Each structure stands twice: as structure tokens, then as C-alpha cells.
Amino acid sequence: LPTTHEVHVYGSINGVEFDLVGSGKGNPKDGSEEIQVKSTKGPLGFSPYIVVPNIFHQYLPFPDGMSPFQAAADDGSGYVVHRTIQFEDGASLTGNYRYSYDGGHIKGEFHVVGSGFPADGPVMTKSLTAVDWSVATMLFPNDTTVVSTIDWTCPTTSGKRYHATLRTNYTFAKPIAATILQKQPMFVFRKTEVKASDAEINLKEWQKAFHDL
Amino acid sequence: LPTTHEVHVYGSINGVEFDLVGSGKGNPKDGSEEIQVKSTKGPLGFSPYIVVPNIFHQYLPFPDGMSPFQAAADDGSGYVVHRTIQFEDGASLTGNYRYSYDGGHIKGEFHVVGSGFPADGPVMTKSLTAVDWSVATMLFPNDTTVVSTIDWTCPTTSGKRYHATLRTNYTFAKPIAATILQKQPMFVFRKTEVKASDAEINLKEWQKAFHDL
Amino acid sequence: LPTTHEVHVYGSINGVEFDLVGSGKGNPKDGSEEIQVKSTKGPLGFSPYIVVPNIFHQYLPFPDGMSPFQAAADDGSGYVVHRTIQFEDGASLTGNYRYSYDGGHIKGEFHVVGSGFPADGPVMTKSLTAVDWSVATMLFPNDTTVVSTIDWTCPTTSGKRYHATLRTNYTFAKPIAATILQKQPMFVFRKTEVKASDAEINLKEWQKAFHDL
Amino acid sequence: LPTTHEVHVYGSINGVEFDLVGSGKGNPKDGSEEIQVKSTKGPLGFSPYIVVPNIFHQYLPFPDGMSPFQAAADDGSGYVVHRTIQFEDGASLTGNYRYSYDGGHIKGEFHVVGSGFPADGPVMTKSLTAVDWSVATMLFPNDTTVVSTIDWTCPTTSGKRYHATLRTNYTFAKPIAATILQKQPMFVFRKTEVKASDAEINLKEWQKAFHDL
Structure with missing residues (x-):
């Protein structure tokens, strides 16, 4: 089970390269997770809130056991992640994640590319x-795949919310336990707390999976 | 507060008219709701499961009080509903709902039009x-509007799920209480039990709203 | 073949009813079409440009013959139309069209409902x-169906464009000629010229279908 | 102006890595383009038709001059490409393209990741x-950006079409000529001819841009 982790996010936003590095910890018992990342290429020219999702589901447990992400982490077999975020704005944000495991410690390597954010939009300003x-x-369409969709929003200064939809496809190296594949769909409630500057982002995340309420 | 209700759904599916009528009850205390509807134009030429959403949020309470739908019902001012469902298939299903209130009894008049369902698709077969x-x-973008989005699926005989997205816009006659507008977003978990024949559909629905978990 | 037509559009926008009536003509030889409509319920509280699509494809010819819409008009069998427009805004606009034919004259009855347009958005202001x-x-998925999708935009005062996607499903009463069903996909280029006041909208539309270029 | 080019596409599909290499030519005068690519990691485990778009708009001229892509190529300043393809299936396909210019010869480096393709779907089978x-x-939202959207389909063995939407965001290094930014929207009609085996794909593409018809 995962106890600590580190990340390296690299790529670009509107054609401008950016690079983040940092580390944190988490409780595989309750899905809580926290991390701090810092830019290695100067101040970020975009809103730090779009990096939130791009900055560890292996900490997520399920009601009756481990989540497929957590089981694949404990297992060492792991999984790869392909995430697509489409903003009401027309902007697109793609994420490709890969992980490495070593005795409770996770190393994440995230390639993130974002484009089409309006110069006068909420993100660039x-x-x-x-x-x-x-x-x-x-949902788990087959024993080696997890698909997660989220209706996402970020409040703006003007009070209105900025909308987007997230679609994340998880591809596992080893078949997911028959136990897990049995309960579908599975919902995950998340909350985040963010404190950030121009070159540093601090995140606290809480995750809670459920099948019934 | 609502205790009983009745519905009249009319319109067409793939150009073929259909008409449903029926009644039921509900518990404004826990969001439970049940109803039975029957066709008045012969056997239904399409899956009854697409009619489920089209067959009363006024029964939905909130953790700290009434839901805007329930408050508008208790109030008598009410609201109108504009629902759009888009299936992975390419099929479209539009719903226009209007209600009438009379001492705990709700009368619903739903105009539903569906089109583009493949002849060999899950719905028509x-x-x-x-x-x-x-x-x-x-979300409540303003004091007279509620927007609800749902990632929806229906299992098929072949085991694969049939996907769709629901987008429902609620327009209220009177401003929604400042208390409600304060807690956003609001999530609603729903479960349904359906027993149906060619000209009769029986539905039991459970709804549970939550802001935190 | 159609030579003249009239329309009656009714429904509501953001819960506020509206009603339009008017007539015009068209050239079934080149797809040109023009019409003038006037409100019967006072000044329109929303942009007239969203009514453009809602204000006669039977005038549209194809390179090698008639378009399925035109053939169904000449035939008298006709077709029904289910249109869904989703704006980047979150606003939804549904259209249900039905026609009547009488010696080259078309009578259209359009039920249009729009909702979720932000009070401070381009449409309401x-x-x-x-x-x-x-x-x-x-595309023509089967001999009784035509599906048309359009990436749509309307320029605003601020210079930025307002985006939407149109999805229109056409259901025919009689099978579409095998000749037509043979050439897919079919593309239709359209241009419009609009002159409008608070209670009157004048439209000139040019349509040109093509399979190759 | 570009006369010849070569490509290197790498990445994965459903977690399985793949790598393509090849070269071709094109006519910057009419937008025609052709290329042959071959796998360097064995037979491809997925349909070659999804690689078509992933296998040079710099060859595209405009009616009144060069296309922004072609001008940026002739210029040497270039542009980067961020493409997102979403299939009705739920599958996602992301593309990140970068080019290099050298006297009429283009070298493309494309990172393509695809996921969520059903094992029993049209692509994997x-x-x-x-x-x-x-x-x-x-559309050209600003002088350094081009946004292109396409309603895309691929016929299947069963006769039904497989649907997807393509969204491509192009970010330029230098401002696009005022002449070009003046005419919007710009449409591009494309046709392709494909001959392919398990480790080799041959493509012929025809492109034609137009503002009016």
C-alpha cells in the first residue's frame, strides 16, 4: 500500500512549456492525499487550478476493499492513465500518466498538454x-479497464463557474479482481483545498468512493 | 409538500406517437417516489427504460432543508423543466415538463420527443x-435557475452498457431561497426499480441529495 | 416542388413564451430561400439570430437530383424534424418541426423551446x-432517416464568436430513393443575411449541397 | 513551400505501444499529399484507419493565398498541434505534433495515445x-491560434458508420497574417485513399479549403 509519493508534470499550455516537481503523502486507509509542487521554469502563466487533477488514486480504498487503482499499486503491476479535459471555453487539456512503485512510495511522471485557452479567459488571466x-x-467495461467521467467546475472571480468535462481511461497491466468488477458503477466524491503562489502549489485532497448511499 | 402525483407523457419516438398516463405517490421526507403508467395507444415500440427519467423532484428534500424543486412545489410557484438526453448512439430525446399543484397533489404534463434511435439499436429492439x-x-447559476447534468447508462442484454448524458435546465417562477443558493454544487444519488410489460411501466425511485460525504 | 412557404414558430425562451408568424418564397432549383417573420406577443427578449435556423430544406436540391427533403416535399409524404442545439454557454434549444404541403406551398409548424441562456450572455443581451x-x-443511417450535424457560430459585439453544435434528426414517412442513399456523406454549405428589429426578422438564406469538391 | 516530408508516430493504443515511420510528398499548390508508413514494432493490433489523421496541413493552400499552416511552414516559424478525437465508443485518441523544416522538406514527430477502445469494437477488431x-x-480566435473541428466517420464491415469528433488546436510561433485572419470561418474538404497491410499503411489525401461556394 502507498504511503508517500512524488510527481513530475511537464508539457505545455498554449504552446508555452512548463515543468512542475514535488512530493507528498497519503493515507491508503481513507483516500486522503496531500502534495506540494514547485515550478522549475519560472512563474506559471496560467491558473494553478487546472493543474489540480494533474497533481494518485492508488490512495483510494473502496468500501468493501481496495480500489482497482490501489490494488494495482499494492500489486506493483500498476496502470497507465489517459485523461482528456474539455472546457466550455473550447480549450483542451490532455494528460498521460505513468507510475513507478517502490515499497509504499509512488513516483509519478505526468505529460500534460493544454491548448486553446482564450487569452482573456479565466485560465490565462x-x-x-x-x-x-x-x-x-x-465503470469497468472489461477486466483491464476503468473509465471515469466527471462534470467539473471552478468558480471564477466574477462569481460565475467555469465548466469542463473530464474523461479518464485507466489501462491496467493485470486483470482487476473479480470482486471489484462485480460492483458497478462506483462513484468517487472529491474535495480539494489549495494554497498557491506563482511558482508553488499546495494541495490537500479528500476522496471517498461509494456504490450506494 | 407533495404526497401524491400523476403524469401524462405524450410525444413521439422515431416519428411514432406514443402516450402514457398514470399516477403514484412519494415521501417528501426521504425522496422516495413510485408510479405506474400505462400506454393509451397500444404496445410501446421502444425500450421502457428511456421513459424512466421521463416518469418529480418536488419529493426531493435537502440535508439542511428543502430542495429548490420541493420549495417551489410547497410554494405553489413551481418551475418548468427542459431536458436534453443525448445517447452515444446519436439518438436525441427532449423533454418539456410542466406541473400543476393542488394540496399535496402534483399533476405533470410531459412533452417528450425522441429521434435517431437505430432500428437495430438497444432502444428499438x-x-x-x-x-x-x-x-x-x-448548480444554481442564478436565483431562478437550476442546472443538472448526469452521466447515464443502461445495461443491455449483451452485457455492454448503453451510454447517454442528461442535461436538465430548471426555470423557476420565484427566486430560490438564499439558503439553498449558498450550498453548491449539490449532488443527487438515484436508484430505480422497474417492472414493465408492453403497455405498462411500474417505477420505484429513491433519491438522496448531498453536499458533503 | 416547393415555391412558397409560411411558418409559425411558438414556444419559449428561458421560460418566457414567444410566437412568430410569417411567410416567404424559395427557388427549389438553387436552394435559395427568403422569409419575413413577425412577433405576435410583443418585442422579443432574446437575440433574433438564434431563430435563424428555426425559420425549409425542401428547397434544397442535390447535384444529381433532389435532396431527400425536396423529394419528400414533391412527394407529399414529407418528414418530421427533431433539432437539438447546445450552446457553449450551457443553454439548450430544441426544435420540433412539422410541415403541410399544398401545390408548391409549404406550411410549417415549429415548436421551439430554449433554456439556460445566461442573463448576461450574448443571447439575452x-x-x-x-x-x-x-x-x-x-448521413442517411437507414432509408427513413437523415442525420445532420453542424459546428455553428455567431459573432458577438465583443468580436468573439459564440459557439454551438446543431444536431438535427429527420424522420421520413416514405423510404428515401435508393439513388440518394447511395451518395454519403452529403455536405450542405449555407449563408444567411439578416435584417431585424424587435418584432420583425427578415431572412435570406442560400444553400448548396455537395458530395465532392 | 513544402515539397516532401517524413513522419514518426509513436505512443500507444489501449496500453500497447506502437511505432510508425515513413515518408512522402505533397503539392503545396493543390493540397494533395501522399505518404507510406511502416511499423517498427511488429503488426498493428488496431485498425489502421484511426492513424489516417495522425499521418501535414502545410501543403494546404487557401483560395486567396497560403493557409496559416503553409505560411508558417514557408516562414520556418511553424506551429505545434494538439488534437483530441473522441469516439462514440468512449475511446479517446490524443495527438501532439511538432515539425521541423529544411528547404521544402518537413520532418514530423507525432506523439499519439489512444485508450478505451472496446475489445469487441470496430477499432480493435x-x-x-x-x-x-x-x-x-x-476559426482563428486570435493571431496565434487556429481551431478546427470535424464530425468524423469510418464505415465498418457491418455497414454501420463508426462516429467521432475531432478537435484540433494549432498554436503558432509567429502571428498569422492579417489577410488570413480576415476571412472566417474557413472550411477544408478532405478525401483519403488507403491501402494497408498489418505493418504498412499507404495514404493519399486531397484537401481543398474554401470560404464561399
């Missing part, structure tokens, strides 16, 4: 104030 | 077996 | 200045 | 037979 709490709907 | 439990994400 | 020329992609 | 001709709608 850093008008987003936070990430709204969200609930993801997850 | 009645291959859907049920409606998967779902969680809706609701 | 009438900031749209025109409808951009567009190209629709049409 | 190689049931696609071709790419349908298409028309893209392009």
Missing part, C-alpha cells in the same frame, strides 16, 4: 478561485 | 435491461 | 451580430 | 473499412 467538489462516475 | 444507479451534479 | 456561414455533414 | 470524406470548420 488566473481568475479561477478554486476547484468545486466533484463526484466521478466509474 | 428493447435490449436494455435496467437503468444504472446515477449521481447528478447540480 | 442581444449581443450576437450575425450567423456565420456553415457547412453541415449529413 | 479491424472492422473499419475506410475514412469518410470530411469537412472541417476552422
